[PDB]
Design a protein around this nucleic acid. Sequence first.
RNA 1: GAGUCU
DNA 2: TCCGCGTCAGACTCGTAATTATAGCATACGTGAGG
DNA 3: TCACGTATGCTATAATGTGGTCTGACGCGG
Lengths: 50, 1341, 50, 251, 277
Amino acid sequence: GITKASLATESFISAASFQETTRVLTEAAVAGKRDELRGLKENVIVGRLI
Amino acid sequence: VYSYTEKKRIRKDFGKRPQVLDVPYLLSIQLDSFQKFIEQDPEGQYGLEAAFRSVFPIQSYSGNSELQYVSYRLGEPVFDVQECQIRGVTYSAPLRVKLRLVIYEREAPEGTVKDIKEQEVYMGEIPLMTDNGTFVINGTERVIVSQLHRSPGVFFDSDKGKTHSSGKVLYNARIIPYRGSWLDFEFDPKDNLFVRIDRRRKLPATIILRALNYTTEQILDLFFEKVIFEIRDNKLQMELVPERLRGETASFDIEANGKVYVEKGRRITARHIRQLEKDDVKLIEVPVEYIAGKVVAKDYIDESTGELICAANMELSLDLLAKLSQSGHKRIETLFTNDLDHGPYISETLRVDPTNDRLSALVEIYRMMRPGEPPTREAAESLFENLFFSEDRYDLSAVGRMKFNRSLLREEIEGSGILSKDDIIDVMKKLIDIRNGKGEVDDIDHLGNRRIRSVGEMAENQFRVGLVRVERAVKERLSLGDLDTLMPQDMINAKPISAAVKEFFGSSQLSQFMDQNNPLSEITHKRRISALGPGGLTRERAGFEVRDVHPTHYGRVCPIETPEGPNIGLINSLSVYAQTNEYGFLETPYRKVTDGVVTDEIHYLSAIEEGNYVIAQANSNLDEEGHFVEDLVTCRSKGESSLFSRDQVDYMDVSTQQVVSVGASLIPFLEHDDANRALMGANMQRQAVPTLRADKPLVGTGMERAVAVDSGVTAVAKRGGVVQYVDASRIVIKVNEDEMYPGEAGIDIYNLTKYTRSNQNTCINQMPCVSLGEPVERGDVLADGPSTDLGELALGQNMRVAFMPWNGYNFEDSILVSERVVQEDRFTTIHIQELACVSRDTKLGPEEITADIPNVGEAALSKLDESGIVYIGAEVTGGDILVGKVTPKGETQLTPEEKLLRAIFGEKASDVKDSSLRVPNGVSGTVIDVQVFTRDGVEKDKRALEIEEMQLKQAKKDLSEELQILEAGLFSRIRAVLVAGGVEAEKLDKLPRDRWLELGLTDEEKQNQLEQLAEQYDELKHEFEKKLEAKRRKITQGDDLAPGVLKIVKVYLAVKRRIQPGDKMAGRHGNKGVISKINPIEDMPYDENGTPVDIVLNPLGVPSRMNIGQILETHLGMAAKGIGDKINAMLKQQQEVAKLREFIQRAYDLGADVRQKVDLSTFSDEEVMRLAENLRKGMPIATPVFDGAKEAEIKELLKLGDLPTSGQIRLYDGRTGEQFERPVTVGYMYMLKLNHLVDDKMHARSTGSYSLVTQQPLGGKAQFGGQRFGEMEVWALEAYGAAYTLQEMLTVKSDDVNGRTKMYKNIVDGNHQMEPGMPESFNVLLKEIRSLGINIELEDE
Amino acid sequence: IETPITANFREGLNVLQYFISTHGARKGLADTALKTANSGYLTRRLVDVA
Amino acid sequence: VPLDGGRFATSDLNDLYRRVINRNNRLKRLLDLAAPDIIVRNEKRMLQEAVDALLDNGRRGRAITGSNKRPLKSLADMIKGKQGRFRQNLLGKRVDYSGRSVITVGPYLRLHQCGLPKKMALELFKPFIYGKLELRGLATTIKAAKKMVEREEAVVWDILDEVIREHPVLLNRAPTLHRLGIQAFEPVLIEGKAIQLHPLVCAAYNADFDGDQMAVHVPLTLEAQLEARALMMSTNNILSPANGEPIIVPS
Amino acid sequence: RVLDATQLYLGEIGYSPLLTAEEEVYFARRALRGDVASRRRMIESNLRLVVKIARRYGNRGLALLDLIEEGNLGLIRAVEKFDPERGFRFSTYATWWIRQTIERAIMNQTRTIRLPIHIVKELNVYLRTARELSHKLDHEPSAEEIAEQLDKPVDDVSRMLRLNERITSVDTPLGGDSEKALLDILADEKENGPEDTTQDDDMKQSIVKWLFELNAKQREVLARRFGLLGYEAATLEDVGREIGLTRERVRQIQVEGLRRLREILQTQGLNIEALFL
RNA sequence: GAGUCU
DNA sequence: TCCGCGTCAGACTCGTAATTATAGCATACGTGAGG
DNA sequence: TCACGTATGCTATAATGTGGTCTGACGCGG
Ligand SMILES: [Mg+2]
Ligand SMILES: [Mg+2]
């Protein structure tokens, strides 16, 4: 489904910006995940070139 | 037939339904509700009286001392409305209440007569309601909206298939008090009954019964029937009620004294039932196997041993039937529990019930609501008694008890606020009846279950919370306090009661800003019902069922009136003839039909009562005080319409207009408009700014005059007579002897409210609409308001409109207006605007208001005076200083470059900087007024001194005129009394009048009159002085301001904004539009006659919209002007008074069978020519809501003005001169200038202020803010590919602090370079996540 | 609704015909206010996944 | 920070930090006092409550309310959901060089054009005017150029006219449902205060003139001028990206 | 079970030994002498008193469990300084400490900007005056009605009433459900915006070039005095430390630099143009 | 909290 | 099967600024100026 | 070593377990 495929993305900044912010951040914090800023959302956030 | 102000201009009415009930006062609910809250009721407690009786007398914890309420009084307000609106203070009255400290002796049982102390104590100032239904809070007229909430009582409800998966309709009950805990009874999937208090946890329903002392045995003998089982010799027998074997299969061979009625496996139909009942069958022999499964009702102990053979509520079997027969029991009682009819619910509930007796239930009930706390017999018993069974913590109120009893089918209507044992059980009984089959749930949306709760009741509620806040401090200080020293006021605090009522008249959702940009907005806003607020719905909690229109609304609430907001079914305007029931439900008038004849006796049927009767509709033709002419009459009953016979008719709708609201009643031809557009039209009619010249509507309904007068904005004659003095400022009318009171002079004064500000910064002026020394009837309009004309409501202007496209300047309802409308300044609006200048106190020092300001050109200081305040009348534009304010500043660190530049010119900044009040950027008008509020003890400006001189001398000439006109009017009567007795006319008037009051007559009834007139003269003489002192005191008095504030100067500007492209206009059928271009007069279309069109509308804005009323309005408006233009021609020609009489007579009696009938033989010559003078602009016509004019009547009227049937004329292009290919619809549509004006809407920003944390631009033109670039707008440039455009808007236009200042410099250097960075809002996200205890760091390249 | 409106806007609706018309009027304007947000939430779910 | 009047204002975090520091300092004092454990436990429960309220207020128990009756906004709240930093101050922004007004027809306009009011376009293009005024040698410094523009001198209208030629502007309507909700045009300076929109692009915006308002944005950088003209120009955006059929269709 | 903090502490203090007359004196005898067991079972036992005193002192500043904590701290100082030698009871003596410790700690924490003891007790004088003035002047008392009752300065009554004004929070909405709050309106005046930022870059980059323009000894003496080019803003007399070493010649040359620069601003187009600024 | 465009 | 938690379109305009209650005085504690 | 604002200290009748809203929905886990 849409809502799950969006959250399954490896970019946690894409996931915490969609929904479920409280959960995304904690599961990413415990796995020590690193978002390498792949998609558009991520660069829109950091204020970079798409 | 018609009065003097009606004689000036009669509306031709196309009505045909004679109005048996006239339109009532439209502002009734605001005045009557609050009037209850203040009127000191003697016994039948209401408002403040009820509040005191409820809470007092309050007694101490020792029980030795108590306070008792005696009586309360309202003091006259400190400032009247006039002075409250000015200073900015609440219009409120001192509340002075007598309270008595009664002390008992602790040695004597109740030694009652010990100390009876007494004082009248201050507690708070309650806001008073104005004459017009408003509260002036901090100098703003505010309205408290009536609320619509769920009525208290019992209400049965059911989740259908929301509860559970199977879709078991779980039936439920709710006992809803006015104060106190809720009581819920509800089923479960398995059909066990359950009880929950305040929607807490589920408890078995038999638990509240045990708590009310009900034994297992009593509980079964409330709900279940009895079946007696007789054991005779050996054979088992059963007592039959033949009706009980009903629609059931015979389980054994039913055989009586000697007849087999039903065999095994055979259905017992209605015939088998009447067979047994006719044969009168009482005992039947049955098998032993049949009781196996039956539930024994009572306890059966062994006579022999004395122990339980079987407990009450336990299923018998053959071995239990053996033990019972042998023990010595041959007559067993048993529960009668059918599977479809009489359901075994309580029975299965008792086995789920873990509790045993009364005390076990009370513990379990205590353990739910106070969990964790160890119970005691004191705590368990006390809690349950203080829930539903205490005078204190529980009250259904009169409405609650009444609706409660009427639901349970009771005889008694009034009764106790507390729940009785009977009440709780009766409710459980009815809940089970509903589950069984007889009984249905009540629906909530029914207005019989929706109660109306206006201001007074909600003000009473808050006032009670005030007294309850004090109850704590009374009980506290009574115990601690010495009894001897203590007076009652040392225990009372005034601040909690003041604060709780101020919370309601201030913070509350229902107290809000009066929408007064229009008389109709005032009156329809005061007639408003919101189901939002405390004790009501929320948007979060609002389904669609509450929102939608309900059968019951009919005649109570208007279905065509509600915002198209998120609040779409929640807020509702009240219908025209609608009223609040004595209890609070809604009701509508109805003409009773007795013997089939329609009686003029009217009955206001409540939502409940309406459903019984059959009500004929208003469309049905009466035989003019005979009966219904048609054998079949269309009527409506039990929420539906069908045709009926005439003897079956019970009632009829009173008026044609009753289903509609005040807003919608003013829409002409509403009958031909789609509901959807009609809604917007009535909503926009409220937004219509009143223009410079109040123009009447040519195509009205007739309600215009009811609205304009009831709105309060028009000055009306309290008593009729001759006008003694007429003036722009005021009107003085001398009254006729018959109405005039015998004491006073009998001269009314109306000082008309003059060009004054509204809440929407629009204009309010009252112009005198009667001439010098004119005869006036009581209740006629003496002066017109902002949006009113000869008493009728005038929201906008009517004009020549042609329906035809034009080079796409009327593209999508875009509007093309002639320069001539803008030239006439007729849609030009006045905007009075209030800007304040405050001298405060900073750390560094107090702020000055002088013309001496650092860093200022002579252009700014030119319009200011010596004190530093602008002259009255001075035109000002954005930048110009209105009030010169200067502020202290520390000796700030001057940067060396600044120090050089200050040393270059010499003019170095002083310690005091600057903060002068200057005209807002771009706005501009003329100063009409300045008001100065200085604090008591701060140094006054010389300007302020001029204003005190102006106010004083004006006050002195004002009260001089009061005593002068009143004395002259008073001796005018004495002179007439003196002639009736001792007639010396000419000789008595020669020497001075000052020695007229000594002169008397012989002692008659007329001598007694001379005495009252002479005593009253001195009363006014002595009152003149104490009045002058009050004005002079209030003018010398320092105005007490907010903390830190030394003085405030309020400047009033007057902007005169004329119409331009962007201004929003509309008609009254929801036909919106924006001016696109003002076409010159030379270019506009013109008919063969040569007369240019005012507005060119798009015909394609009609068929989609389905609002045909605008076209009927146009055709009739044309016909009406056609009559005006004929009378205008006859008055210019100067033909004959008899000729004007004939033509106007044929016009007023043109309709097929018109309601109104104007004979012109009654009108004198002078009266006719005043009328013709007003009809020449066009004969105003009235089209009642559903009783409107038909096509035929309109076409007939068109022939009277020598205009085409078609209402389409040959127009010619103004540019070219050649004809348009086809006839074009032209006529007069009453249009309206909406408050959405483009001067306010247009906004622009390059660079500005930034927010504190986010460091992003501000929001709104109020703050001069940038535009919101949302994720919606982000996805658009994402989708295109333009990533630079987006990055621009994400960095250098937004947060990037280096980016924004750097980029501004790039662009002034010419270089359009992207030198970006990272948003500060991300930097914030980092620290906000790190403060959560989450390491978020930037792992780099 | 089992009873439809026989009349048209040229002829004019009577008191009841209008009252019946308002049921449908309000429910339409109601969806313009409320149900738009179930629809706009679909836009948002779709964008976050793609 | 100080409200203009003497009143001050503070965040809800300061109020939650204070509860935490008070209870932590008191706990240190009660450990110093070697008080019974019953007292120490109450203080440790209250410390857990204040920390839990600081981080996420309404999650563990009923949220701690302040003066207003509403609960104090916690840290978690400034991160999470709609009014959180993400959805409101980061995946979307307030923007410099922007305005709006009520739109009205321009049936004379060409499909690459839109009416832009005088005074709107003047405030919009301020930095480019200060830049032209220094180039032509009319103003010495920016403060001098600021006053020339504020007085609305005759020379300034001529230079404004110069900047705007061949310098496109972005026009946006709510709601922005699809990309065509924003289109670029060549600005035409007009006399009134109302935006003039080309009738044929009205279908993409779903814009009727019964009082719609449209947002104005200046593409400042040259990249943005080229992106506006090459991608987002009205004349380049004719077919619908949803369906290969023209949205630009007479009605 | 009960997982709430309040009703759990209340369960604990419940099963606590309620002390009698010489039971208090028996333990407090060894408490002042110094006993492990006495301090605890005196304090443990008398927690039930603290709750009742704190229950009445509520809805004023802190919640409830806060008043109990500071109340328990007053009960401990009651036990340290109790005198069993005196015949008078403990519940009498401890009621003075628990009412006191709560009153005096509430004054400090209830207020966001820390309000001190003098100013608060000053204020309570004015507040209780107001309630008595109010019953007889119906309307609330003015700051001059309060100042003139005590015959004390109107400034001093205004000063203290001004400190009573409560603090509104930034996250408080003006809208309602969810529109905008006060951060969404309030500007950061400390960070100047691009227009204000670039103006002092342009004012001061204009001046860096006007320095190279005037004579070599005139732009030396003028710049280093105001602290434009030098390190420290010196005076006419202090320019003598560098190379000037004059008092008359420094003052003639400072003003000579400014007079040539005044005509540079008359010709470039400022002078009276930039006088309003 | 009352509105404006969808 | 029930309880808990998580979602619920997009911009704009306006509008206002609320309340309570803490006793009273005596020695101690810190910084700043004057002899 | 005072002056001044700020803080700490102690009061002995007895007194000893606390007290605002009541209505969403449709989905998806544990
Ligand atoms: Mg449209
Ligand atoms: Mg529109």
